Amino acid sequence: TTIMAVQFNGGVVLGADSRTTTGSYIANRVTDKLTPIHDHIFCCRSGSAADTQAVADAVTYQLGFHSIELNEPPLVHTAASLFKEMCYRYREDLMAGIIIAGWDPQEGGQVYSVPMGGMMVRQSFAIGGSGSSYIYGYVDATYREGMTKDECLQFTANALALAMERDGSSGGVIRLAAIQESGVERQVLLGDQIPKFTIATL
Amino acid sequence: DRGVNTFSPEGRLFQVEYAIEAIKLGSTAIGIQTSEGVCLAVEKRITSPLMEPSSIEKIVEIDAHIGCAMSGLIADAKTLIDKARVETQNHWFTYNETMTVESVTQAVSNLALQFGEEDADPGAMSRPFGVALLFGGVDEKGPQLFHMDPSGTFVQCDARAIGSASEGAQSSLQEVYHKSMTLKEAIKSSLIILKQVMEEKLNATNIELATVQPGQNFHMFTKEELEEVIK
Amino acid sequence: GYDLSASTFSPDGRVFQVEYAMKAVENSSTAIGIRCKDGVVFGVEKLVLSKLYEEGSNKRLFNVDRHVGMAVAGLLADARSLADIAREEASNFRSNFGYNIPLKHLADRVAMYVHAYTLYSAVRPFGCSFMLGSYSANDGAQLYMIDPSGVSYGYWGCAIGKARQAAKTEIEKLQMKEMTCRDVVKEVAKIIYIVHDEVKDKAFELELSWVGELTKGRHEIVPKDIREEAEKYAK
Amino acid sequence: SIMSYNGGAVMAMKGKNCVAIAADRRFGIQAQMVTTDFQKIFPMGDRLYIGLAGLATDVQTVAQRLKFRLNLYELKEGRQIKPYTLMSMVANLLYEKRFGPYYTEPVIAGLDPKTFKPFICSLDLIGCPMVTDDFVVSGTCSEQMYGMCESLWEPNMDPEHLFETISQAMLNAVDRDAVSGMGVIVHVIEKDKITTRTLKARMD
Amino acid sequence: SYDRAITVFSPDGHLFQVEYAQEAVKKGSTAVGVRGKDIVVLGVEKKSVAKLQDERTVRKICALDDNVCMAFAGLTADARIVINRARVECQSHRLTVEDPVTVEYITRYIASLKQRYTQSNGRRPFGISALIVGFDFDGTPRLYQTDPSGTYHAWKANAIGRGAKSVREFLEKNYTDDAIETDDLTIKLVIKALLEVVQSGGKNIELAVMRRDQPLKILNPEEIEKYVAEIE
Amino acid sequence: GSSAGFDRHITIFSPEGRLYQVEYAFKAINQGGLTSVAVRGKDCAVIVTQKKVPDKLLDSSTVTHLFKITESIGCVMTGMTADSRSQVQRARYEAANWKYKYGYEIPVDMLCKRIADISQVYTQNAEMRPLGCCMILIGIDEEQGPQVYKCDPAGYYCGFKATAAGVKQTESTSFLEKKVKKWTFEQTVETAITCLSTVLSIDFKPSEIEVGVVTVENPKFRILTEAEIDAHLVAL
Amino acid sequence: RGYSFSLTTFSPSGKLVQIEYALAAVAGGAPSVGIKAANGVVLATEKKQKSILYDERSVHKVEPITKHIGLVYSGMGPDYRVLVHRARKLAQQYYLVYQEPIPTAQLVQRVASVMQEYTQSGGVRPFGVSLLICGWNEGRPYLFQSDPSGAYFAWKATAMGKNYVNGKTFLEKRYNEDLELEDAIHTAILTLKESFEGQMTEDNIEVGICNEAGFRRLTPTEVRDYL
Amino acid sequence: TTIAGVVYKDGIVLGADTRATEGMVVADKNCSKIHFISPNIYCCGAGTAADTDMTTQLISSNLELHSLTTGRLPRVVTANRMLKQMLFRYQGYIGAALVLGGVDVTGPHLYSIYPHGSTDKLPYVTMGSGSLAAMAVFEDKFRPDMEEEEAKKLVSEAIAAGIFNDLGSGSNIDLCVISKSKLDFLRPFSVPNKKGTRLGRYRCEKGTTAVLTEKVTPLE
Amino acid sequence: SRRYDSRTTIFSPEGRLYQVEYAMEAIGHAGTCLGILANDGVLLAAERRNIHKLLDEVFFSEKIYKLNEDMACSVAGITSDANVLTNELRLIAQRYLLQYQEPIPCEQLVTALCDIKQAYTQFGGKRPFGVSLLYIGWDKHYGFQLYQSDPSGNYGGWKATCIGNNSAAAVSMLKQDYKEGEMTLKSALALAVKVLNKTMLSAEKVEIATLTRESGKTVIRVLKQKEVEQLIKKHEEEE
Ligand SMILES: *[B]([O])([O])[C]([C][C]([C])[C])[N]C(=O)C1=[C]N([C]2[C][C][C][C][C]2)N=N1
Secondary structure (H helix, E strand, C coil): CEEEEEECCCCEEEEECCCEECCCCEEECCCCCEEECCCCEEEECCECHHHHHHHHHHHHHHHHHHHHHHCCCCCHHHHHHHHHHHHHHCCCCCCECEEEEEEECCCEEEEEEECCCCCCEEECEEEEEHHHCCCHHHHHHHCCCCCCHHHHHHHHHHHHHHHHHHCCCCCCCEEEEEECCCCEEEEEECCCCCCCCCCCCC | CCCCCCECCCCCEHHHHHHCCHHHCCCCEEEEECCCCEEEEEECCCCCCCECHHHCCCEEECCCCEEEEEEECCCCHHHHHHHHHHHHHHHHHHHCCCCCHHHHHHHHHCCCCCECCCCCCCCCECCCCCEEEEEEEEECCEEEEEEECCCCCEEECCEEEECCCHHHHHHHHHCCCCCCCCHHHHHHHHHHHHHHHCCCCCCCCCEEEEEECCCCCEEECCHHHHHHHHC | CCCCCCCCCCCCCCCHHHHHHCCCCCCCCCEEEEECCCEEEEEEEEECCCCCCCCCCCCCEEECCCCEEEEEEECHHHHHHHHHHHHHHHHHHHHHHCCCCCHHHHHHHHHHHHHHHHCECCCCCCCEEEEEEEECCCCCEEEEEECCCCCEEEECEEEECCCCCCCCCCCCCCCCCCCCCHHHHHHHHHHHHHHCCCCCCCCEEEEEEEEECCCCCCCEECCHHHHHHHHHHHC | CCCCCCCCEEEEEECCCCEEEEEECCEEECCEEEECCCCCEEECCCCEEEEEEECHHHHHHHHHHHHHHHHHHHHHCCCCCCHHHHHHHHHHHHHHCCCCCCCEEEEEEEECCCCCCEEEEECCCCCCCEECCCEEEEECCHHHHHHHHHCCCCCCCCHHHHHHHHHHHHHHHCCCCCCCCCCEEEEEECCCEEEEEEECCCCC | CCCCECCCCCCCCCCHHHHHHHHHHHCCCCEEEEECCCEEEEEEECCCCCCCEECCCCCCCEECCCCEEEEEEECHHHHHHHHHHHHHHHHHHHHHCCCCCCHHHHHHHHHHHHHHCCCEECECCCCEEEEEEEECCCCCEEEEEECCCCCEEEECEEEECCCHHHHHHHHHHHCCCCCCCCHHHHHHHHHHHHHHCCCCCCCCEEEEEEECCCCCEEECHHHHHHHHHCCC | CCCCCCCCCCCCCCCCCCCHHHHHCCCCCCCCCCEEEEEECCCEEEEEEECCCCCCCECHHHCCCEEECCCCCEEEEEECHHHHHHHHHHHHHHHHHHHHHHCCCCCHHHHHHHHHHHHHCCCCECCECCCCEEEEEEEEECCCEEEEEEECCCCCEEEECEEEEECCCHHHHHHHHHHHHCCCHHHHHHHHHHHHHHHHCCCCCCCCEEEEEEECCCCCCEECCHHHHHHHHCCC | CCCCCECCCCCCCCCCHHHHHHHHHHCCCCCEEEEEECCEEEEEECCCCCCCCECCCCCCCCEECCCCEEECEEECHHHHHHHHHHHHHHHHHHHHHHCCCCCHHHHHHHHHHHHHHCCCCECECCCCEEEEEEEECCCCEEEEEECCCCCEEEECEEEECCCHHHHHHHHHCCCCCCCCHHHHHHHHHHHHHHHCCCCCCCCCCEEEEECCCCCEECCHHHHHHHC | CEEEEEEECCEEEEEEECCEECCCCEEECCCCCEEECCCCEEEEECCCHHHHHHHHHHHHHHHHHHHHHHCCCCCHHHHHHHHHHHHHHCCCCCCCCEEEEEECCCCEEEEEECCCCCEEECCEEEEECCHHHHHHHHHHHCCCCCCHHHHHHHHHHHHHHHHHHCCCCCCCEEEEEEECCCEEEEEEEECCCCCCCCCCCCCCCCCCCCECCCECCECC | CCCCCCCCCCCCCCCCCHHHHHHHHHCCCCCCEEEEECCCEEEEEEECCCCCCCECCCCCCCCEEECCCCEEEEEEECHHHHHHHHHHHHHHHHHHHHHHCCCCCHHHHHHHHHHHHHHCCCECCCCCCCEEEEEEEEECCCEEEEEEECCCCCEEEECEEEECCCHHHHHHHHHCCCCCCCCCHHHHHHHHHHHHHCCCCCCCCEEEEEEEECCCCEEEEECCHHHHHHHHHHHHHHC
16 A cells, blocks of 8 residues: 655645555455545545545544534544544554545645554655555655645655555555645546656666 | 422421431430440330230340440331441451441441432432431440431430430430449439330330440340349 | 423423523623624623622633633523533533634534423523633634523623613624724723612622633633723723 | 264255155264263154254254244244244344354254145354255264265155165264264154154164 | 332321331231240131132242241232242252251341332332241241331231231230140130131131141141131 | 313323324424425425524624535524524434435435434423424435425424425415415525515515525525525515 | 333223323324225325325325335324334344244234333323234235224224224125225225215325235326226 | 456346355355345355355345335445445454445446455456456456446356366356346356266165164144 | 322322222223133133124134143233233243243243232332233143233132123122032033123134143144034023
């Protein structure tokens, strides 16, 4: 699994792979890891498929009801706090690595990291999954403040592509998402559209 | 109709006020506290010659150093007497020492007002205990006589009389009791007062006297002993 | 016999027990609330029943949160428990969603708890009314009011208690919207000195609490100096 | 294995208009035989029999609890229980203890009330119904029983032809198992009779 | 579950519910009890002596243990509940202590359960009285009597139910130290007490004696007819 | 008109087999002093309610009888205000619970039925009283188009073409009865306003009522603005 | 909390007035007619809202409990919704254990048990509705009637609601043993026409039939032709 | 066990084998693995046989109750949610991996539910021990918007791949075609295996088995 | 809450329990049920109060129920209360047979149901069961038996009894017509019919059930329409 979320002025850019493996076998080669929690709030799932789906459904329910009572677009921090609560409560029973990223009228585009234990930390960009270990040095040397919504989409596509080649648990296609104030725009990157890097050869 | 936890206009719980009126129909029990022990005496009041008078236990043993005389609804007092027995046994198990007379009276007075219909459990009282108790024992402070009624108010008294003829007996103790009176003198005074307020001619099988002295334990006078002071 | 329980409607269609609980709020002292351009000012005329009491005893103004205030009327024992109920809701909300609870939501949450005591025979309706005031950068200056029936509404200037029909005609002459908070305090202490009966009633302490931009969105009791000067302006 | 503690084997076969249910009679704790007449087949209503194999304590418990349910069911809706309905009832009972199941593999055999159509089935410990058209085996020697029935069973046998097949299958299957045998009881259920005979087996 | 206070005090310090439970005991059949020297007797008047009713299914005398037995007066349905709870305590006492229960121990338990129902929520007091009779380990015959309120006393001879006062007065003047001298004498005193509160006594009386080291023995009609002939 | 025992105090059958307590809750709906009108069109549903403002100090915005149950379901409450919010809170929870358990948005007739079932429990249990309010939900069904439902304090609910509630319920239903025997987005709104105006005889101004609509082209429940409600007001 | 004492108690004459008052509510509701006829059972009811604003297609009086069991009622509407939901859960529960459609007689007994529980339980009143269950199992038709007290009777042809005594006379002298389902509907609607006040249409009544194929609720078209 | 399903032009085609083993022994050579959830929704189930039946039987009764209430046709999402939520609550202890396929108002949907509670909405799925063999056929011949007859042939080849390459699957092939206007439950669809003919008879002539006891009882 | 309370399980001044006494009044307005004990069996002759020209026969009986293999009973009172009571009786008999693996004795069963009836008259604050039962059965300890039970929880064994409409009139007739110890099933049926007629008959207005022993097996059977019809004709010959 290789999920990634970066942010720009307008909003945020999400990305993930689509491989679901049960051992050394790919049960689902086109999994959709990016899950919408609300209109402008998404979340990348990593870890256990059953655990991340159960939590996302629960949070989506709680956030929807909360947003209907307050009669206002929910805050991205509120969605991240809900996720964090369940992730911390059942930390000994769940295996998730959720990355909440959305856009709200108050703070704009935000990216939150909710790792296994259940802690919540806001970053400008976050990477998760088993294939995120190979691109830690790449994102630290390529990320630059001031990236636009176009550069963020190329930055995420480049990092995900590099992690899919080295990780056996990551592969398939690339599902991107650019969330701004206007709305959400999904986009898939297949074979030819997936960034390629010449393999060192003698 | 009202609930069990209803206050009257004068500021009194109806149930407790009726429970105090039920103690005026019970047998009389005079208790006199001295310096050389406490003495308790109750009027057995047998209603039939076929009725065995040895089955009437108005005075019980809470512990070796504590006795108890009850009046009013005797059946309700069997639950309070057991609580006191378990309380003094529990104290010994935890602190390896005898409980004081005032401590035993305090633990029995806590259940006095523990009753109600709503917000209650299966094993909860539905009404108050219509009985009065006279606790007499000997601790570190020496002879001590306590009195506890249905309201849950326990006070200390040098001489107390509870029962049907309490008013008449209480007054006879106010002018025949002094601080230097002996334990043997107290036993006669009680017997004399009991004989006056009783309907049947006092005898060895009618009443029941008990005494608790400093160095000794709780003791219930037998027929022989009772007869000695009767003549 | 249709006014002994809250789970009984009368022939005309009224819940007498809830109407009897509103009678208790009309016997208490007058408390007013005024919302302006950047805050809310609470003015409660504390009626001192004795000279033995300390100046400040039996307060009718509490902070339910760090940005929310609460002025009460009617039974004080009931109102104190409602203030603790409002504190729990505000505290539980911050531990769930991670931020201060909106006044509109806090009012609704506490009004729903008050409406639950007006349906059964096992309990009785609260015999008190109260106002909730707060200030938020994103929101603004809010002022809600809840009565014994569990009804909560938004206001510009509210008044509860005995003299509330006479205190509402004094708050109607003010142009709260354009007004600030330091200028409102005076007017708030002036209306409480006008509605208060010096004959029927005896000594009375004037309470004053506010919450707005001035105190950076934090609800507090109006400063002694500013309260003392406002009390002189009323006289 | 817990199932191989008491041994035993039950078999049910289907005929033209009849059914047969056979079982071993040896009751024993591990390698030691206690009695040689333990009941493993119980009557659930005239033309309905249930054979239980596995833990002897669970064989008696399940037979008694099923009877308790069967009695209430027949009293409530005053009618004879149908073979297929009994299987669902038994399966439901076994599935209640899905995580602390009874160690017994039931084998139901009987004729449908009024229609008199043969019916045989088997269930696992957690109540997994399996209705077949030829035979059903349950025990510590199912492999041996599977091999016998596979090459002996015929499509439409009669009461006498069916009795010979189920007896030869059981007699030769329990002779290859050590903790199974000590007599064989066979019940042949017909439309108007219930023949029950004990075969002359090896006492080993 | 019901948690209403049924038994409560009244203006004069009375407990009406318990008083109505004692009123139900007065409408019951007369149950007489006489303690002898080596034999305890129990007599019960049979009001509804229908000829079409199995008399073994409607008896007032029961056995709690092998040394304890009892008779009652009041609501039969309640007596059954009290009788079966006492039977479980006898078996419980035998399991905790090697020896069998003493007459007083079981009487105390029966009376304590009655007092429990007169002070708890959702329940009403028992409408029966009991005459527990038996022998202890020492061989001392015992006779106790429990009532609806929960109080019990030891007796030498007592009667309960309708017309219990008339029989009690007859025992006071007739129970001496010569009337219970012999086995038959003690059994004849119980049959004589029931003859003053019954119609054509002899075929409407059911008694059971309990001798030392022996189980309950219910004397049938024939045996009771032989005793009535000696009292003529 | 006969009675015995405590039939007028608790929800228990009377001699004639009626529930006086439930009938007293229908008179509590008129206590509020307002009227609601919902008219079903051909491709839209329109909710029209009276927006009275007793005091000028009252923050008008907060005063409303229209609520957003879901993204496509809206409703109007009539009667006891406190009861109304309670019931509106119940409908929001039941609607949110339905989507989380079944995976799809709750139908307008299912929600109404579910809320009516909860109201029937108050008519059977004697420890609590029924709610003195009404609910009129309007939503757009994916198969049957626009829907207008209504459940009352007795636990009875139904589907309508045009409904009314409040003090003037018989007036608005007798006027809607003759109008239905004889509708587009504007025609569905104008018929509601006229019914509400001809029965109350007030000739409403802009800020004096509130309208809620759910069209087939835009299923999201929405509240018309001050400048949106005025356009229809100057059309007649 | 809730009351824990019985609301329905015995009177001095030995009558359970609460149940008797609930039967009076059932006797004032819309008339219902059940007819069992050889190859099937028919249930018809006066579904007239009489106002012309109510949606006739929305509400339903005749409901299907299962695939072979139909239900109809007389009395209170909201009370019937509770019993229909209970009857549907009882049929599902039974099918989850025996894996076979619950017999009509078994369902009535189970549903009558629920109605008897509201006549003895604490803080509740008896259901103010009388049901007319109909089913088809084991190649045979069934018609049962469960009143407010919890008692159930097996009928051949019956009628509840308003003018039920009048319909029982018109049904006792117009119903025949050897009757077919198709002809059974004709006499079921004719019995409802003897106390229908106004004009009977295809949207004023609701008819549900039961046969070998399973319970079915006749559509407006079918009824129209029959009328 | 080999269960599979695909989504063709206008419907869903489910398939499965009919062999049930008790270890390495064939207990049932003709068991049904395709369960009925509702009129428009069916379910193929592998994993623990007992759990697969009980879970589908419970969800089918819940969907039937829901259908009676709403009065509409059940959705595939509803069945999916119910299954996935219940499966997740037992923490994987209910070994039931099923292939859920049906056609509703939104169209034809095919899901795959795993024991732990995870689901996957794909155009074709395979479950069981012979899942990899059937997946190879789907990853080599599957095309979108296939014809009904083409989908039946492709799903038959997938079940056949598992039946002949996996030891845990055998017997016949079961198919189930669910479309917008029909529901064709073809059992069996294809019989690729047939027991060999006997080479000789082994009939047990009467009297070949000795009897120690004998008791006949005449039933009414 | 305490004002709406009716206080069902409460004593009264006379010391009686009103609720239980009011339930006994409802049993006197029910179908007459009579039981007679013979030497080779015991029968139940109850009158059918559910008569009409539009009622189906459907069930096997209307008042007589089967508790278990060797027991049966006839109720008289609230019909819905019997449905609850008789279903509980079946449970008690099944629980006992599951414990000792033997049929529950008749007196033990009747006693167990009476403990439930008496619990509703002492606590719980609920109305008592308004039904009276008649039991007939056979056990290895006492053979054929006949028990009666009322709403208070009281029970007793009889030889001949009657509960329902005319209990007092029927009881008197049985008193002067029951030859104790010399009664046969055949001669008992006459007694039932003779008493049933003089206390109210057609062959559809009544229902009879007999319980006899055949080859170490209890046999309970309801007499058929024709079977009863003949009995009714034979009583007319003596009248
Ligand atoms: B990722 O590889 O971390 C990915 C993230 C999920 C899709 C949100 N996890 C998995 O690959 C994965 C696979 N599984 C199950 C294993 C058992 C069989 C069913 C699938 N769980 N997580």
